[PDB]
């Protein structure tokens, strides 16, 4: 009946040498951690230590070339750090970035291990830099290594190769890297909700559309729920969970749930444009706790309003600890385009999931 928590201030050391106001700030994690103290949640959790992922562990999802290049940045001079970062889509690199990315991944490995050994029931990981845009062979979108994807493979490496892992990605952006890593895999079900705007929203690829259902034996195991033309919030996320996420997840019957928990869909975010409330995130967390014998690991991804992410993630930890879940209005009408999105995903995935037929 225990909730784990991992946070290590060393992950603040990754920083933008050329724009100290870049939104992926060191204080994202320290603000969330401080809010857990203010709300007296920290002392209710079992503290799980951070550790470095090993290069062998990184190779569970990433190419040797990509690992080597990011590793090479540890000792680079500033001009070379600037040039390397510019080779990617939306990446800044400091001499601490590689080690911080290793700590983010290793923290989540230790948390998954604590869950799978039964030392804790569930856990929260207050880590940065984020991971879900990172691909097998490249960094992208503030992300170096795909922490959630690596954690799924790490869990499989200690319990069972075919362990059924559900990754729910509620960051406002599509986790292109996670989708691609598992696109042909039926042991890892990837479900993403994300702003799409017909491809106008970052990362600006049709890979995020509802018709990308997976490949080969992975067909049906990639669920994209894309939002267009509306300021989405609690009603739309609750509806997507009710009609799509939970029916599919229950049929898949995961043995471990990882949440790619960005908080950039939150009210107040400078980028997301959405209005999911802390109660909304608590509702989603509580729903996921009904799966996988409660084995849920919440992993910080994006989210850029420091006050919003601190309150939102803290409310998720409150749910993991067993606090009473919020009651929300399931009768509020959805934005009209959200109904269209949900119907498009249902049509795309009904061939693969009997719960949708």
Ligand X SMILES: O=C(NO)c1ccc(CN(Cc2nnnn2Cc2ccccc2)C(=O)c2ccccc2C(F)(F)F)cc1
Q: Which residues are annotated as a binding site for Zn(2+)?
A: 171, 173, 264
- CB neighbours of 29 closer than 8 A, spacing ≥ 6? 7, 9, 11, 12, 126, 127, 128, 300
- Minimum separation from the CB atom of position 304 to Zn ion (A): 8
- The size of the interface with Zn ion (CB under 5 A), counted in residues, is 5
Asked whether 168 and 259 are in contact (CB, 8 A), the reply is yes
Window 130-169: contact mask with K ion (x via CB under 5 A): ---------------------------------------x
Find tokens 């479900």 and name the residue.
191
202 lies in the binding site for ligand X (CB under 6 A):
yes
- Give φ, ψ of 226 to 5 degrees: -100, 135
Question: How many CB atoms sit inside 10 A of residue 197's CB?
Answer: 16
Which one of ligand X, Zn ion, K ion, none is in contact with 177 (Cβ closer than 5 to 8 A by kind)? none
- Minimum separation from the CB atom of position 152 to K ion (A): 10
Q: Which stretch binds Zn ion (CB under 5 A): 76-84, 165-173, 319-327, 340-348?
A: 165-173
262 lies in the binding site for ligand X (CB under 6 A):
yes
Which one of K ion, ligand X, Zn ion, none is in contact with 221 (Cβ closer than 5 to 8 A by kind)? K ion
Residue 115 CA: distances (Å) to CA of 108, 118, 134, 198: 10, 5, 25, 38
Find, among 280, 274, 335, the residue nearest to 305 by Cα.
274
Q: Kindly give the pairing relationship between strand 165-169 and strand 256-261.
A: parallel
What does the alpha-carbon distance between residue 228 and residue 341 come to, in Å, rounded to a whole number?
8
192 lies in the binding site for K ion (CB under 5 A):
yes
311 lies in the binding site for Zn ion (CB under 5 A):
no
Asked whether 36 and 5 are in contact (CB, 8 A), the reply is yes
- CB neighbours of 133 closer than 8 A, spacing ≥ 6? 140, 141, 142, 143, 173, 175, 176, 177, 203
Find, among 4, 100, 35, 2, the residue nearest to 297 by Cα.
4
Q: Which of 106, 218, 235, 262 binds Zn ion (CB under 5 A)?
A: 262
- Minimum separation from the CB atom of position 174 to K ion (A): 6
Window 87-126: contact mask with ligand X (x via CB under 6 A): ---x------------------------------------
What does the alpha-carbon distance between residue 237 and residue 274 come to, in Å, rounded to a whole number?
11
Which one of ligand X, Zn ion, K ion, none is in contact with 90 (Cβ closer than 5 to 8 A by kind)? ligand X
3-class SS at 256?
strand
Return binding residues: 171, 173, 264
Window 287-316: contact mask with ligand X (x via CB under 6 A): --------------xx--------------
131 lies in the binding site for Zn ion (CB under 5 A):
no
**Angle separating helix axes 147-158 and 97-116, nearest 10 degrees:** 40
What does the alpha-carbon distance between residue 84 and residue 76 come to, in Å, rounded to a whole number?
9
17 lies in the binding site for ligand X (CB under 6 A):
no
Active site residue 283: no
221 lies in the binding site for K ion (CB under 5 A):
yes
- Position with the least CB separation from ligand X: 302
Q: Which of 31, 121, 164, 194 binds K ion (CB under 5 A)?
A: 194
204 lies in the binding site for ligand X (CB under 6 A):
yes
Residue spans of beta strands (DSSP E) within 81-199: 122-126, 165-169, 188-195
Pick out residues in 123-142 that bind ligand X (CB under 6 A).
130, 133, 141-142
Query: Residue numbers of the site for K ion (CB under 5 A)?
Result: 169, 171, 182, 185, 190, 192, 194, 218, 221-222
Chain residues binding ligand X by CB under 6 A are 22-23, 90, 130, 133, 141-142, 171, 173, 202, 204, 262, 264, 271, 301-302
Active site residues: 133
């Amino acid at each position: 009946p225990i909730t784990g928590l991992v946070y290590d201030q060393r992950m603040m050391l990754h920083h933008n040498m050329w724009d100290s106001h870049h939104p992926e700030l060191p204080q994202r994690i320290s603000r969330i951690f401080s809010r857990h103290e203010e709300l007296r949640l920290l002392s209710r959790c079992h503290r799980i230590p951070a550790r470095l992922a090993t290069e062998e562990e990184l190779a569970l999802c990433h190419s040797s070339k990509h690992i080597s290049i990011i590793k090479s940045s540890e000792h680079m001079k500033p001009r070379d750090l600037n040039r390397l970062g510019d080779e990617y889509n939306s990446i800044f690199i400091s001499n601490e970035s590689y080690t911080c990315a290793l700590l983010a991944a290793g923290s989540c490995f230790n948390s998954a291990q604590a869950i799978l050994t039964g030392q804790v029931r569930n856990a929260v990981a207050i880590v940065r830099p984020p991971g879900h845009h990172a691909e097998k062979d490249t960094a992208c979108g503030f992300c170096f290594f795909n922490t959630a994807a690596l954690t799924a493979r790490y869990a499989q490496s200690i319990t069972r190769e075919s362990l059924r892992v559900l990754i729910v990605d509620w960051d406002v952006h599509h986790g292109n890297g996670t989708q691609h890593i598992f696109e042909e895999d039926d042991s890892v079900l990837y479900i993403s909700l994300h702003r799409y705007e017909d491809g106008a929203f970052f990362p600006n690829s049709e890979d995020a559309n509802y018709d990308k259902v997976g490949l080969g034996k992975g067909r049906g195991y990639n669920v994209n729920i894309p939002w267009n033309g509306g300021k989405m919030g609690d009603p739309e996320y609750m509806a997507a969970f009710h009609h799509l996420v939970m029916p599919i997840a229950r049929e898949f019957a995961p043995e471990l749930v990882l949440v790619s928990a960005g908080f950039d869909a939150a009210r107040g975010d400078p980028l997301g444009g959405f209005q999911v409330t802390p109660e909304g995130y608590a509702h989603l967390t509580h729903q996921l706790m009904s799966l996988a014998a409660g084995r849920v690991l919440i992993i910080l991804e994006g989210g850029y309003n420091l006050t919003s992410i601190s309150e939102s993630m803290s409310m998720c930890t409150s749910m993991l600890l067993g606090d009473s879940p919020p009651s929300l209005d399931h009768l509020t009408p959805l934005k009209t385009s959200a109904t269209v999105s949900i119907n498009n995903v249902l049509r795309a995935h009904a061939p693969f999931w009997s719960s949708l037929r």
